[PDB]
Each structure stands twice: as C-alpha cells, then as structure tokens.
Amino acid sequence: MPFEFENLGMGIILIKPKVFPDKRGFFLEVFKSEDFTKMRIPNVIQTNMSFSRKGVVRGLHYQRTPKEQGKIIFVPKGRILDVAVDVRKSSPTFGKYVKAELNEENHYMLWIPPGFAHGFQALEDSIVIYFITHNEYSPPHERCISYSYIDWPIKEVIISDKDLQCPSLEKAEVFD
Amino acid sequence: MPFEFENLGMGIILIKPKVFPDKRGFFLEVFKSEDFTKMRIPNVIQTNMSFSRKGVVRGLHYQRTPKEQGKIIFVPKGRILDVAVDVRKSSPTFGKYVKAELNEENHYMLWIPPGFAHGFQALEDSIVIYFITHNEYSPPHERCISYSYIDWPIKEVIISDKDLQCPSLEKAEVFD
C-alpha cells in the first residue's frame, strides 16, 4: 500500500513492494520519494546494475565518510543472498550482520544505511539493481571487507581477484 | 563521464552507458544525478518496473501539468520498441514521435521530458524500469493518446482495456 517495511535490525529494512499482475505481465512501484522519506530513507542519487553468474560473490563494499552511501538492493531477475555487516567501530553490533534473500519471485528489497558493508552471492544468474543514496561513486573513498567474513551457501564461488584481496574486518579501515 | 548522449530531436535523448564485462557477468552505472544534471535531466523521485509478455503494448501515457513527469526508460531484460510523441499543442513538432529500440544488449535508455506521451511494445518478454522525474504518480492527472497511432511490429497486440480507450490527439487533454 504500496510498501510494507520490516526492520530486520540495526537500521536495515526489508521493503516489500506490492505487485499487480494482469494479462500483460505485472507492474510495481519500486520506490517513491515521499513514502521512503516517511521511512527516513532519503532520495536515490545514483543507480547501478550488475549481472552475476550463479556462485558469484561481490563485496563486501562501502565508501567511507565524507562519501558514505546508502543502498536499496533489488533483484528483478534471479535470486541472491544479500548481506549487510555493521562496520561502525563504536556500534554495539559492530561486526554483526543480516542476511536476506532477495529475488525476482518476492521482489523484496534491502535498505542498507551508511556504515554497512554490502555484498552478495548469486544463487542463480541474477540481475541486481543498486539504488544508492547520500553520495555518488568516489574511488578514493572505496573500501572493503573480505567475502570470507560470511559463509556463502554456494561453494563454487566466483570472486574477482580484486575482491579476493579485500582485508579482514580487523585490518580494514572502517566507520567510526 | 561514462555516458554518451545522442539527441534524437524535440528534447528526447538516447543515453548509452558504459558496460564492464568480466568473468562474473557485467557491471554498469545506469544513472548518476550530477552527470544527468549536466545534460539537464533532473533527479529521480520515483522508480517503477514492469514485466511485459511478448506483443504487449503499454501507452501512450503522460501526466498533465502540474503533475507532469519526465522519464528515463531502461530495459534490463528483453527488448522493446519505445516511443515518445510530442503532445505540447504549441510545439512545432506537436504530434511528431521518435521510436528507439531499447534492449538488454545495448543497455540504452531514453530520456522523455515532460510534454511527451510514452509507450512501447515488448518485442520479447521484457522488464522495463522507468526512472521518473518532476512528480510522483497521481491518478487524477493521468492521461493518454491512442496506441493505435503507431504501427507496432507485432500485430498480435496484447493491450489493457484502459489503454484501448485512449483518445485521439484532438480529443485528449494535452500540454499547452
């Protein structure tokens, strides 16, 4: 009506858009500025997309202040295990995480505020859309924590050489 | 800037993003507010999605002032013929249209400013994302012109009852 929001912990929210099927296919509103603002999810200022073969893992990524990003993750085709880990030193849940299956069949989305490291595994070949808030892409602010922080369900992982080099949490430049 | 912009006339712009493929699949930046602002495409306030079976036509839609909408159309899966018709009564190209194929291979986008009627036919089963500017969804301001103006490639058209009723250019409430 047209969105159910569910707090999953730590400021992360599962968003569940309403899907309207008819003879043509279906339609949904994915995000709207007023409704999201009512939930204190600010406006999207950039959107990216990836296509990822089954077993791919991307992450775990974040940009540091002053270019911190919020993210709404959505999966129009396929299915992922999506993850957000608290990477804020002084948080009482620093290092805790939430996993959320996002897929084409649920159309659910994950909102991940600034201060979290994001990644996922592709459980099937998947298109992921990333609606990004706060700040745009800025290379010298990119950081990451190692994929190995998480025990991914598909063992036949496909990870870039770059992400394979991400540091452990204890050695990463994280949030205050 | 990782976009190329081709003017198709009347204010319509085809946008061609840079895609980065690798062993995982691919990645692209789809929209970036500071880059789009430079081409005078304002920021997104709502994003929708549809799935449309082969042969579907949706359109030709707009919202009237003062709930007018700009739209960037993108096709992450499939293939559409996208159409924008100038419905500004005082414009020198009143009633002229552009047609552009937008698809999952090219990853092209069409920027359709306020004052145009938008529609497409799905050439195969297709997911369309609509990035909407200026104003959110407003039912009392929704208007349309007949899809029957367009010689669609697939004769086996699948079309909603509502879109069947869309009026002629002469009888419709259009833009000044």
Side-chain angles (χ1 to χ4, degrees):
Chain A
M1 12 95 219
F3 306 105
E4 284 179 66
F5 306 77
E6 167 181 5
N7 281 61
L8 291 179
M10 323 193 286
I12 298 271
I13 301 164
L14 191 60
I15 301 159
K16 316 185 171 184
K18 205 170 249 155
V19 180
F20 296 90
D22 71 0
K23 75 185 181 183
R24 288 167 311 160
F26 60 72
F27 175 80
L28 65 149
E29 297 177 296
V30 180
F31 83 82
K32 323 171 59 160
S33 174
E34 200 193 281
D35 304 39
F36 270 39
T37 289
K38 193 172 203 250
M39 291 330 270
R40 264 184 328 168
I41 305 165
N43 289 353
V44 173
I45 50 77
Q46 148 172 17
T47 300
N48 292 349
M49 177 170 112
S50 63
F51 173 61
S52 305
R53 298 229 161 253
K54 177 178 182 174
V56 161
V57 172
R58 300 177 189 258
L60 300 174
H61 303 330
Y62 60 99
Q63 288 190 169
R64 292 200 4 97
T65 183
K67 298 312 200 166
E68 75 270 22
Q69 308 176 298
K71 305 169 179 166
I72 296 79
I73 311 299
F74 175 62
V75 179
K77 191 206 91 167
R79 179 163 81 115
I80 80 191
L81 219 220
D82 202 57
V83 194
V85 2
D86 202 334
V87 122
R88 282 171 312 174
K89 227 319 189 103
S90 46
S91 170
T93 45
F94 180 62
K96 295 294 168 306
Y97 64 83
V98 292
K99 294 174 176 179
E101 194 175 295
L102 310 176
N103 61 44
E104 70 178 287
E105 175 177 328
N106 63 38
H107 289 125
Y108 291 177
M109 312 178 306
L110 202 73
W111 157 242
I112 306 177
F116 295 70
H118 167 241
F120 65 82
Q121 182 171 53
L123 302 182
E124 296 298 344
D125 300 356
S126 298
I127 300 170
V128 174
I129 299 300
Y130 324 57
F131 299 120
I132 284 152
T133 70
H134 291 82
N135 291 101
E136 293 187 13
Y137 176 49
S138 170
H141 304 84
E142 286 185 311
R143 292 298 184 279
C144 64
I145 267 64
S146 177
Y147 72 96
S148 66
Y149 198 77
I150 301 290
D151 198 21
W152 303 102
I154 290 179
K155 172 199 97 117
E156 292 71 32
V157 179
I158 308 172
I159 313 200
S160 64
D161 294 346
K162 186 163 151 76
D163 275 348
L164 192 62
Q165 299 296 307
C166 299
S168 241
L169 181 50
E170 55 258 48
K171 279 319 208 275
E173 252 210 80
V174 294
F175 282 66
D176 304 306
Chain B
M1 209 210 242
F3 300 100
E4 293 169 18
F5 301 82
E6 168 174 2
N7 301 117
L8 298 189
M10 316 191 278
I12 303 301
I13 301 166
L14 191 70
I15 312 180
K16 314 183 241 220
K18 184 171 191 169
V19 187
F20 293 88
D22 74 3
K23 69 185 174 146
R24 299 171 298 171
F26 61 81
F27 172 86
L28 64 158
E29 301 185 290
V30 177
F31 101 67
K32 302 179 86 168
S33 80
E34 206 54 273
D35 289 343
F36 272 41
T37 287
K38 297 181 196 146
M39 302 308 305
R40 242 176 33 69
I41 306 180
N43 291 166
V44 176
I45 38 69
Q46 175 171 342
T47 295
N48 297 339
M49 186 166 104
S50 58
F51 173 73
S52 312
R53 302 200 269 136
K54 185 168 174 186
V56 163
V57 175
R58 299 178 193 262
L60 316 180
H61 305 141
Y62 53 102
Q63 281 175 182
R64 76 138 138 211
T65 191
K67 304 305 209 183
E68 73 283 358
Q69 295 178 136
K71 306 157 182 182
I72 297 105
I73 307 311
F74 177 64
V75 176
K77 178 80 191 84
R79 187 175 171 234
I80 74 180
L81 189 63
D82 207 53
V83 183
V85 179
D86 189 346
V87 296
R88 297 168 297 179
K89 187 177 37 162
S90 89
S91 153
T93 51
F94 184 54
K96 185 178 190 173
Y97 56 88
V98 304
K99 307 201 276 195
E101 181 179 325
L102 299 179
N103 72 29
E104 73 174 75
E105 286 161 79
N106 64 34
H107 300 294
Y108 291 168
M109 299 174 268
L110 240 214
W111 163 238
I112 299 176
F116 290 81
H118 170 230
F120 64 89
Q121 180 164 56
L123 301 183
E124 54 195 66
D125 291 2
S126 299
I127 294 173
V128 174
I129 294 187
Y130 311 70
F131 302 105
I132 289 150
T133 68
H134 288 80
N135 288 282
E136 291 186 31
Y137 173 59
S138 181
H141 302 92
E142 285 191 311
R143 292 299 185 278
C144 64
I145 62 164
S146 175
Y147 74 111
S148 192
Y149 280 125
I150 299 303
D151 180 30
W152 298 109
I154 298 180
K155 286 234 270 137
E156 294 67 39
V157 168
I158 299 162
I159 191 165
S160 58
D161 282 352
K162 284 178 183 21
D163 282 345
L164 205 62
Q165 298 298 313
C166 299
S168 74
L169 196 57
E170 285 76 34
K171 293 307 173 142
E173 278 118 288
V174 305
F175 292 78
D176 303 325

